Structure 1
Amino acid sequence: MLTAEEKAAVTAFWGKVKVDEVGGEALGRLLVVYPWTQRFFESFGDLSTADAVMNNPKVKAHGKKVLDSFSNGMKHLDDLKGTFAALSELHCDKLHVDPENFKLLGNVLVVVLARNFGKEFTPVLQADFQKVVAGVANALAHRYH
């Protein structure tokens, strides 16, 4: 996991992030870029075109929730295994989400951050977030590990 210097700057940047707006885009792009993930969200309504996906109210409302779990895990970087312990058990027994798909969403989130911040999301600032989204990725797969 992160050190002191890595941790302090990862917190600083996250403050400027708009939880509402980033969550919907990430989950949307996950369903658009990796379209086999759409089966898990059949109940969400219409998923035919990428425009219908990126404007789906249930999708966007749920993306906000996943980012709230991400914001919470950002405050508990010393222990991600215990923070994401609950959701980990949810994705296995109730959802059967393959642990590989967490890597893709962590990566999507990073791309989503980069688009909305351009150069301000420095190559070093990216690498530090690559430890976070991978640190989270392992915590949701701890039932499979």
Structure 2
Amino acid sequence: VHLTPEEKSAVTALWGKVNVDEVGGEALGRLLVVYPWTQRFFESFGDLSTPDAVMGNPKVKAHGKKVLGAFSDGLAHLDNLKGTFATLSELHCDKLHVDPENFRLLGNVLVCVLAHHFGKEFTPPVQAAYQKVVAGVANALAHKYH
């Protein structure tokens, strides 16, 4: 991921203010509400029939935390995203059978969540850096598909 040092500092500075558990739940939740067919990856999670059922679903919230925890961990390894996410890539392909286009959708929803939380502070330049990061993570997660 070609990130300027000023981009890398922008990403890290902001990420330091993020409550990963909360943001993880919001991002996954909004994915399932905005793009409802993605609910077909989570049929064991119970009630996802209305926006409040999704956003407040304890299994959705817990899974969001797991997802974003792995994301943060990627942020500490920006120079080797492919390596950091190899085993997760394999898992998402061979076991879960998740179309990688969904990683791009989640990335974009995460960006909206960041904007929503930080308001003005999520400036156009900051967003641009986060766009490179989310595309880099999606690409890394898709890399072991075969």
* Residue type at the aligned position of 2:28: L
Residues 1:75 and 2:79 aligned together? no
Equivalent residues in 2 for 1:131-142, closer than 5 Å: 131-142=132-143
Per-residue deviation, residues 113-139 of structure 1 (Å, max 9, x unmatched): 000011110011000000000000100
Distance, in Å, in 1 between the alignment partners of 2:145 and 2:89 is 9
Q: TM-score, normalised by structure 1?
A: 0.97
Instruction: Find the counterpart in structure 2 of residue 62 from structure 1.
Output: 63
Instruction: Find the counterpart in structure 2 of residue 86 from structure 1.
Output: 87
Instruction: Find the counterpart in structure 2 of residue 144 from structure 1.
Output: 145
1:102 Cα deviation after fit = 0.9
- Root-mean-square deviation over aligned CA pairs: 1.0
Per-residue deviation, residues 40-69 of structure 1 (Å, max 9, x unmatched): 101111111111001000000110111100
Distance, in Å, in 2 between the alignment partners of 1:123 and 1:5 is 14
* Residue type at the aligned position of 1:20: D
Report which stretch shifted further, 2-11 or 121-130.
2-11
Distance, in Å, in 2 between the alignment partners of 1:96 and 1:20 is 25
User: Gapped runs of 5+ residues in structure 2?
Assistant: none
Aligned residues: 145
Shift >2 Å, 4+ stretches: none
Q: TM-score, normalised by structure 2?
A: 0.96
User: Gapped runs of 5+ residues in structure 1?
Assistant: none
Distance, in Å, in 2 between the alignment partners of 1:39 and 1:122 is 34
Instruction: Find the counterpart in structure 2 of residue 96 from structure 1.
Output: 97
Percent identity over paired residues: 84
Distance, in Å, in 2 between the alignment partners of 1:111 and 1:9 is 17
Instruction: Find the counterpart in structure 2 of residue 129 from structure 1.
Output: 130
Residues 1:37 and 2:47 aligned together? no
* Residue type at the aligned position of 1:143: K
Distance, in Å, in 1 between the alignment partners of 2:48 and 2:11 is 34
